[model samples]
Target chain A: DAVMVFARQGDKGSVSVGDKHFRTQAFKVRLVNAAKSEISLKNSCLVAQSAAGQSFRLDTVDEELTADTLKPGASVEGDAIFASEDDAVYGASLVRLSDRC
Target chain B: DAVMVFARQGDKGSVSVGDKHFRTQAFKVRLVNAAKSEISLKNSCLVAQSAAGQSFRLDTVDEELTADTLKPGASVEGDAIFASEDDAVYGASLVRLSDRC
Candidate 1:
């Protein structure tokens, strides 16, 4: 099962899937008050010889990171739906990257 | 005092202050349908001997450009307040830099 967690600093916490590690950001701006404040890292391409050569892009979903100010210790979670056509090694990691990026 | 204008294409029309020309973008995202649709370019640095060596940055305020989708030909306008204390040369230009930035 996939779990979502939030914290003040991206460096303070991390998500580990198998051997991969995905980091979270320190602060994120949210749009609405009732919105879920979790971060998602969507797979940009499939895993294969031709696909492995392609670079991965972090595509953030509906959550807003530039609108409203998010304070420290404000964390949330939700279920992540993986759209895999066939049963495969669905192990990936999440991490909090730098804010400069 | 300044005026804010809206348009569909940056190439179609432009705003010229003194001899400086500012171009409008093809599409600009907006939030809250009732909100005024306009663009604002604030003066980042005061023109001076030491300030002239510094670069200017486009600081967009209270505007959401990524979450919403804006159609073409939808235009609006509003009043702009310029704060110049030294009665210095306040003439500048505005331009649609690019979407890729």
Candidate 2:
């Protein structure tokens, strides 16, 4: 939680989306901006980090959080999805993103 | 929506949670509290209304929305799950949630 940002992960399990049954293990994260200024929650800010030291890309980002400018004390909730067909996720959080002091 | 609350449905398809591959079709609804005062979002306030005159119970309610007292202009997103093995949902929205005029 760099820059006073906080993440709470939940629903750490399987989710099958749409037709073709695209299955994946999703981490539903509630990201809060505990910082004093606006937290730029860009799409690349958070990732689903695997135990094998792999940082997963965004499989899906909820509408409320896409490139959002999170005001201080405001919170946004969404999922960080992983390709469970091949990979395994151990954690999901804000790995690398820009926020000023 | 007895209130000015709004609902937008998305991801209207399959979701398989946990082991044993327990499957169901989920309606991902984004609910917005457009009212002025704090809108009390009780657990049983909203429901999935089928086109066949059926009111589906709560299958999954996201943590943020459970008994949430929503402030004006804030939004919450979650799924309204249905037993698609036997039932079908044509539309889902804010059916009978209360707020004064």
Candidate 3:
């Protein structure tokens, strides 16, 4: 079974699956650096989930992350984009490039 | 001031904005009736929020609802996709066809 964690708006938390550690948080207003457009929109929140060392994949129901690669303790943040006020939960799993499953 | 409520996965809740009441809940698997495709995909949840006797607009940062009209105790259900494990909260407001802010 995969372990999961819930991140609240303006709050941050972390979770672990296997040997990898991940950090996640939700933001009220986040600027899409690539789009260079400010997402001052409401009713939704932006989330940032990252890990250290080993790379992982970020999975959500419908939305996609701009960047998902976690390189050497680096973090990636993007809009999880939710239509509800309820907090958001995300799942992270280690991606094995090699055949080990 | 705008009132808000938080709905959890597999659980139901209600909130009132102004004189309108809204019922919202999150589901693990939701069938997109219009698409005729089962959204069995993981890492996300579906949400349903509705009102009675009044028309309201559903607002989210980057999501669109299939049906948003509330006609006399009617409800609308759709996927409020999220990449995180956090619960979701939504905002519903009354939409006026006539000029009255």
Between candidates 1 and 3, the one scoring higher on DockQ is: 3
True contacts kept of each: 0.00, 0.00, 0.00
- Summarize candidate 2's per-residue lDDT along B1-101 as a digit string, tens digits: 22332233344444555643323445554556666677665543555443334645555656655545667777776665644433355333223342221
Docking level for model 3: incorrect
Whole-model lDDT per candidate: 0.25, 0.47, 0.28
- Candidate 3 lDDT over B8-40, as tens digits, reads 233345556687655543332212223322322
Q: How does the DockQ of candidate 3 come out? A: 0.02
Candidate 1: residue A31 Cα off by (Å): 12
What tens-digit string does per-residue lDDT give for candidate 1 at A1-101? 12122211112234567876644222221112223443332321111101122212333432433223323334333222222222221211112212223
Q: Candidate 2, residues A1-101: lDDT per residue as tens digits?
A: 33333445443323221111112335556666787788565534555554565655555667765545678788776655554332244344433343321
lDDT of 2: 0.47
Q: Which scores higher on TM-score, 1 or 3?
A: 3
As for TM-score, the candidate ahead, 1 or 2, is 2
Clashing pairs in 2: none
